[PDB]
Amino acid sequence: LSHVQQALAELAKPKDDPTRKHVCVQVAPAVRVAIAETLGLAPGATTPKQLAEGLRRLGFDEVFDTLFGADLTIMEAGSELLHRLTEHLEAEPLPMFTSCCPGWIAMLEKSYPDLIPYVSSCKSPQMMLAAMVKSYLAEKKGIAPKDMVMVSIMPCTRKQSEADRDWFCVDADPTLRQLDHVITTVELGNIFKERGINLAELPEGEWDNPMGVGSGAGVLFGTTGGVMEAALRTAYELFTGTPLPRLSLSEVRGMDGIKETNITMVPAPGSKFEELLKHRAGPLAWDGGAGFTSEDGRGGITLRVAVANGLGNAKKLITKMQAGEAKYDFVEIMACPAGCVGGGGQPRSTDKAITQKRQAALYNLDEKSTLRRSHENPSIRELYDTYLGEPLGHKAHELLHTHYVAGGV
Ligand code: SF4
Ligand SMILES: [Cl-]
Ligand code: NA
Incomplete structure (x- = not known):
């Protein structure tokens, strides 16, 4: 009944189940930097590709970068x-x-x-990517938009209200949402912990390109x-x-x-x-x-x-x-x-400077120079x-x- 529960129910269907949908997730950068804190680690202590692997282990068919x-x-x-x-x-x-x-x-x-x-x-970024996935990518893959589920992981307790604006839907059917479910950093961290998934111990996974072809996340360095x-x-x-x-x-x-x-x-x-x-x-x-x-x-x-x-x-x-x-x-x-690194869906810390730490680890130093x-x-x-x-x-x-x-x- 909650959006977390609905998303997890879609993932719980075996991939070969005739009622299985194509379940997609997109991830905000503020989530990537703070998710390590859900394990009691420092911001940025888990890599983006470890998070991509963790999400694929939950059963997501596509893992996108917002x-x-x-x-x-x-x-x-x-x-x-x-x-x-x-x-x-x-x-x-x-x-x-x-x-x-x-x-x-x-x-x-x-x-x-x-x-x-x-x-x-x-x-917003999450809504533009969602609109694209249930139009361009659905058509490319030959999947009916109604058989696509789009989940976003956000630092924000308000992004579901954004997604829920009535006209953010496919072909004027308000029940066919462009973006179905928003999950916060802390809700996702709880999902991993409840399943015994430790992001820090995962191998590097891979992103999918929302264009449906090519390697990587479809975003340049x-x-x-x-x-x-x-x-x-x-x-x-x-x-x-x-x-x-x-x-x-x-x-x-x-x-x-x-x-x-x-x-x-x-x-x-x-x-x-x-x-x-x-x-x-x-x-x-x-x-x-x-x-x-x-x-x-x-x-x-x-x-x-x-x-x-x-x-x-x-x-x-x-x-x-x-x-x-x-x-x-x-x-x-x-x-x-503090902006989105300090969003309401982020882990709570006793460190008064935790948002500074998040901002600093938000992108690596090699990418920051470019x-x-x-x-x-x-x-x-x-x-x-x-x-x-x-x-x-x-x-x-x-x-x-x-x-x-x-x-x-
Ligand atoms: S500033 Fe806060 S409320 Fe606004 S999008 Fe970012 S996390 Fe959400
Ligand atoms: Cl967004
Ligand atoms: Na890929």
Whole structure:
């Protein structure tokens, strides 16, 4: 009856049982780093492939990395940000708010419904991957979507409410969910312990590529800095023709839980963006944007970015934004004070710095030194080229975008 119980019941069916479904799991990075703590070990003390092996030992037919879903979110959100910028340069409002945290989306709908048009229409990484699995991958494997079960392992006690939004379903049948069951880090750790599975003693397993062909997880080596940063990078690099380094946000004096950075953007020589800047020179009192110019006319825009952690802190930021005392163009609100590594589904620790330890072990040092870019991922390129079309296009909109409901759902 619980979602854990339903998922385990699907796995309990022998693989050759005529009523067996194709049971898929996707795993968030915050889960991978914290799951070792369920054994009393340090964050990161078990490897990603040990976790993949453990999941395969529970009976999962596919084991996916949610980072594949995040590459889709980066493609869509980066394009969406650049589109809003483009529309505003040529005279879907700015500022844009990210949409990946369901705690934020719940507060948005209930308490700030007038802000709905400013929020990204992107689904979350877990929902984009789920939508893809029950469309593209089902078709590829010749499996009816109703015979697919999608489970996510999340650090978050709110991701089931996200998955349960009614229209996240296949062909307007609300009982055919894109994402069926969410299991938290601690629930999964309990499942392993109840079965005598010790992740730390497992051999390395393998990931499956959600494209259904090829080796590995379908995500390239390296790190992005997360969906918000990589969406910014996508827009910035197209706008300027120059690389965006890893960001370092600074604390905002006088506002708890708020960090910021300003990103100066000069359009690439000969680009449409350069043309737009030169030729064409609501609830949130947006100031028409920050810009700069030089004596010879090489002008640019300055993108003002904020991240709010904690919903109380976000409410204070929104108050200041409405007052015009805080001026931002792109804002990420996450409900958890420490972000997802400190989510409500994570192990409890006496270590006041456990979330710092989780963040540090979240990706290895070799991968942290390497910046990767979602649009360079051959699996992502193939999916757009042969199935989705263009970011923000009709098919991408259908599978990967969503809407919001004033008053909540
Ligand atoms: S910040 Fe917290 S509530 Fe929001 S997605 Fe992450 S774990 Fe869930
Ligand atoms: Cl997600
Ligand atoms: Na594989």
